[PDB]
Amino acid sequence: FVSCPGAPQPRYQMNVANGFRVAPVLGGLTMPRGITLDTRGNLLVVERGRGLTGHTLDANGCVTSSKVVIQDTQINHGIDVHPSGRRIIASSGDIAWSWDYDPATMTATNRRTLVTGMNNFYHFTRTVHISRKYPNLFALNVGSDGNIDVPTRQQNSGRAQIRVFDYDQLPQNGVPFVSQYGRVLGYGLRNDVGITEDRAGNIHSIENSLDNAYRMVNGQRRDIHTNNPAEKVYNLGDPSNPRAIFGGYPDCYTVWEPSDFTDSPKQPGDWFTQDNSGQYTDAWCNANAVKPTLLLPPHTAPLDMKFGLGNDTNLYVALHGSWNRQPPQGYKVVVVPGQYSASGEWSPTAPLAQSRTAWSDLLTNRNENQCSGFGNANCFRPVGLVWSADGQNLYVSSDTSGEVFIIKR
Ligand SMILES: O=C(O)c1cc(C(=O)O)c2c(n1)C(=O)C(=O)c1cc(C(=O)O)[nH]c1-2
Ligand SMILES: [Ca+2]
Numbered sequence: 211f212v213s214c215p216g217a218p219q220p221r222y223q224m225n226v227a228n229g230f231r232v233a234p235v236l237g238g239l240t241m242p243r244g245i246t247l248d249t250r251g252n253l254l255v256v257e258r259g260r261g262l263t264g265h266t267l268d269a270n271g272c273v274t275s276s277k278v279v280i281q282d283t284q285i286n287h288g289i290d291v292h293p294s295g296r297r298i299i300a301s302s303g304d305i306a307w308s309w310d311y312d313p314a315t316m317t318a319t320n321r322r323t324l325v326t327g328m329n330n331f332y333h334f335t336r337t338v339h340i341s342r343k344y345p346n347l348f349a350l351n352v353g354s355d356g357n358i359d360v361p362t363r364q365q366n367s368g369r370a371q372i373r374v375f376d377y378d379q380l381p382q383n384g385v386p387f388v389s390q391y392g393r394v395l396g397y398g399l400r401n402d403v404g405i406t407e408d409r410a411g412n413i414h415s416i417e418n419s420l421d422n423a424y425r426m427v428n429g430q431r432r433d434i435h436t437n438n439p440a441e442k443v444y445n446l447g448d449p450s451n452p453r454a455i456f457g458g459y460p461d462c463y464t465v466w467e468p469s470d471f472t473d474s475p476k477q478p479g480d481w482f483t484q485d486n487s488g489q490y491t492d493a494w495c496n497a498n499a500v501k502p503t504l505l506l507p508p509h510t511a512p513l514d515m516k517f518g519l520g521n522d523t524n525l526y527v528a529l530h531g532s533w534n535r536q537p538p539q540g541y542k543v544v545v546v547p548g549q550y551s552a553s554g555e556w557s558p559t560a561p562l563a564q565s566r567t568a569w570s571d572l573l574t575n576r577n578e579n580q581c582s583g584f585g586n587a588n589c590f591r592p593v594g595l596v597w598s599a600d601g602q603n604l605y606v607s608s609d610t611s612g613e614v615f616i617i618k619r
Contacts, residue, residue, distance in 0.1 A: 211231050211270060213233045214233055214234065214272035214273065214616070215272060217233065217235055217236070217237065217272065217273070218234055219234070220232075220234050220590075220613070221590065221611050221613060222588065222611065223576040224573065224575070225573070225574045225575075225576070226572065226573050226617065227545075227570070227571060227573070229619065230573075230617050230618065230619060231617070231618045232616070233616055233618075235253075235265075235271070235273045235605070236276070236613060236614040237612060238612050239257050239263070240258065240260040241257060241258035241259055241609045242255045242256070242257050242258075242608070243257075243286065243335075243593050243594060243607060244287050244288055244593070245593075245594040245595070245596050245605055245607045246289055246290060246594075247291075247596050248298075248316070249294075250313040250314070251598065251599060252264055252265060252266055252267065253596075253605060254289060254291070254298070254316075255594075256285055256286070256288070258286045258287065258609070259283055259286075260283070261278055261279070261281045261283070261285065262279040262298075262300060262318065263278055263279060264278075264279040264316035270618075271598060271602075271616050271618065273614075277316060279316050279318050280300065280309065284305075285300045285302055286334065286336075287301070287335035287336065287337060287403070288300055288301040288336050288337045288338035288351075289338060290338045290339055290348070291311070291340070292340050293345045295311070295313050296311055296312070297309070298318060299324065299338045299340060301328075301336035301337075301350070302329075303329045303335070304327065304329035305323060305326050306325040306328075306336060306338060307324060308321070308324055309321050323383055323384035324375065324377070324380055324384050325350055325375060325380075325385060325387050326387070328350070328368070330352075330353075330355035330369065332355045333353025333355070333400075334353075335351070335353065335401075337349075337350070337404070338350060339407065339413065341374075341411065341413075341450075343407065343411025343450075344411065344449060346377050346378045347374050347375070347376055347450060349374050349375075349413060349449060350387065350392075351371075351372050351399075351401075351403065351405060352369050352372075352373075352387060353370060353401030353403070354460070355369055357421050358420070358460050360460055362459060362460050363398075363461070365394050365397050367388075368386075368387050370398060370401070371398070372394075372395045372399060372402060372405065372413075373387060373393060373394055373395060374392070374393050374395050375393075379391060394452060395446050395453075395455070396415065396444060396454070396455040397456060398458050398460070398499065399417055399457040399459060400418060400419055400420065400459040401418040402415040402418075402444075403418060403512070403514070404513055404514045404527070404528070406516055406517060407449075408550070408554060408556035409553075409554025409555075410553045410554035411448060411449070412447050412448065413445075413446040414445050414446065414515070414525075414556070415444050416441070416442070416444075416506075416514075416515050417442050417443075417512070418512065419439045419441055419442065419508070420463055421435070421509075423435045423439055423463065425438075425471065425482065425484060426485045426486060426487070427473055428473075434467075435508075435534060436508070436536070437466055437470065438465065438467055439463035439464050440464040440465065440466035440479075440502075440506065440508060440566075441505065441507065441509075441510055441511070441512050442502035442505050443502055443503050443504045443506075443525075443546075444502050445503050455500050456499055458495060458499035458500075461490040461495065462481045462483060463482055463483070464479060464481065464482075465477065465478055465479060465480045465481070466505060466508050466566065468480075473486075474492075478563050478565065478566050479562035479563045479565065481495035481501075501562060502562065503562065504525075504546055504560065504568065505565045506529070506544070506546075506569060508539075509532035509533075509535040509538075509539060510531065510532060510539055511532060511540055512528065512529055513529075514593060514594045514595045515527040515528070516597055516604075518597070518601065519597055519599075519601030520601045522601060523547070523549050523550060523556075524545045524547055524548060525548055525558070526543060526544070526545060526572065526595055526597075527545075527546065528543055528595050528606060528607075529541065529542050529543070529544060530591050530592060531578065531581055531589065531591050538578060538579060538581045538582060539578050540578060540581075541581045541590065541591060541592070542571055542573060543572040543574075543592050543595070544569045544570060544572060545569065545570050545572050546558055546568060547560070572617065573606065573615070575589040583610075588610075590608040590611045590613060590615075591610045591611065592606050593609045602618065602619045603618050
C-alpha cells in the first residue's frame with residue numbers, strides 16, 4: 211500500500227512509526243472533527259459548519275464516495291453510532307439529538323431532541339459516547355465556561371463534567387443536561403473532549419488542562435505554564451453505576467514537571483493548587499480529588515482516544531497541539547502501553563508517577579516545535595480517531611487542515 215486512488219497529496223510532511231503506513235483518504239473538508247465507523251464499516255465525519263458526511267470505503271479502507279448525511283451548520287464535534295447500527299447521536303454546543311439511521315444508504319431521518327441547554331462560548335464541544343456494554347446509555351461532556359470556572363465546584367453547575375443518560379427513559383422532547391436524567395459520572399473535569407470505553411465497559415476520559423498556570427511562592431507569582439500542568443486520563447468506571455468521581459478542577463491540577471515546585475518536593479501525578487492557601491490547598495486535593503491514571507505532556511491538547519483491538523493492548527491518543535506553549539508541542543498521534551484484566555479492564559503499564567516517558571509517537575509532523583500556525587509553519591492537527599473492526603486501519607481527522615488520514619498496519 212502506498213496511497214488511495216484519487217486522494218489528494220498530504221498537505222504537510224507526515225512521519226509514521228516503524229511498521230505502519232499513512233495516507234490521506236479525504237481532503238478539502240470543512241473542519242472535520244469527530245469521526246466514527248458505522249456497522250457496515252462506512253466512515254462518518256462531523257464537518258463543523260457543514261454537517262455529518264458519509265463515506266463509502268474500499269477493501270483497503272480508502273474512500274470511494276462521499277455524501278451529506280445530515281445537512282446542519284450547528285453540529286460541531288460529537289458523533290456516535292448505536293451498537294444496533296440503526297441510530298446515531300450528534301451534538302451542537304447546546305443540544306444532543308438522535309436520528310434513525312440506515313447504513314445501507316447512510317441516511318439519517320426522524321431527528322429527536324435528547325439533551326438541551328448545554329451551550330457556553332468557551333468550551334463548546336459536546337462529545338457523545340454511546341455505551342457499548344450498556345447500549346441504552348450515553349455519555350455527554352460539557353467543558354468549563356472559562357479557563358478557571360469557579361462555579362464548577364458544584365455538580366449542579368452543569369459544566370466541567372460528564373453525565374450519563376438513559377435513552378429509553380427520556381421524554382420525547384428531551385431533557386436539560388442538569389436534570390435527574392443526567393447522572394454525573396465525573397465532575398471537576400475541565401474539558402474532557404476524548405471519551406472511550408474499555409472491554410469491561412469502563413468509561414475512560416482524557417482532559418485538556420489549565421492554561422497559563424502559575425504557582426504562588428512566598429507571595430510571588432511563578433509562571434509555570436511551559437511545562438505544567440499535565441494532560442491526563444481518568445478511569446470513570448461503570449456508567450451504569452455513576453458515582454460522580456471528582457477530578458479536581460477548578461482547584462486541583464496535576465504535576466507534570468516537578469522542578470517547578472521548589473517550596474516542597476513533588477512527583478509527576480501529584481496534586482498542586484496555584485495559591486496553596488485557604489480551604490483548597492495541595493493537602494486538600496490529596497484528601498478529596500481522584501487521581502488520573504496516566505499523564506501526557508502539557509498543552510498537547512488531546513481530543514480523542516481509542517483502544518487498540520484484539521492483541522493490541524495500547525491506547526491511542528490524538529494530540530491537537532498547543533497554543534499556550536513556546537515552543538509548541540503535540541500535533542501528533544501517540545501510543546500508551548497497557549494491559550487488560552481477565553474481565554477486560556484496561557490499565558496503563560507505567561505507574562502514574564513514571565508515565566511522563568511511557569507514551570511514544572505514532573504519527574507526527576516534521577517537528578512539533580515548528581508548528582506556530584503563522585506563515586509557512588503549518589501542521590496537521592489531530593482531532594478524531596477510529597479503528598476499523600479488523601484492527602488494521604486507524605483513521606485520523608485533522609480539522610484545521612481539512613483532512614482525514616488512514617494509518618495502516
Ligand atoms: O493548552 C493549550 O495550548 C491548548 C490548546 C488547545 C488547542 O489549540 O487545541 C486546546 C486547549 N489548550 C484546551 O485547554 C482545550 O480545552 C481545548 C479544546 C480544544 C478543541 O479543539 O476542542 N482545543 C483545546
Ligand atoms: Ca490547555
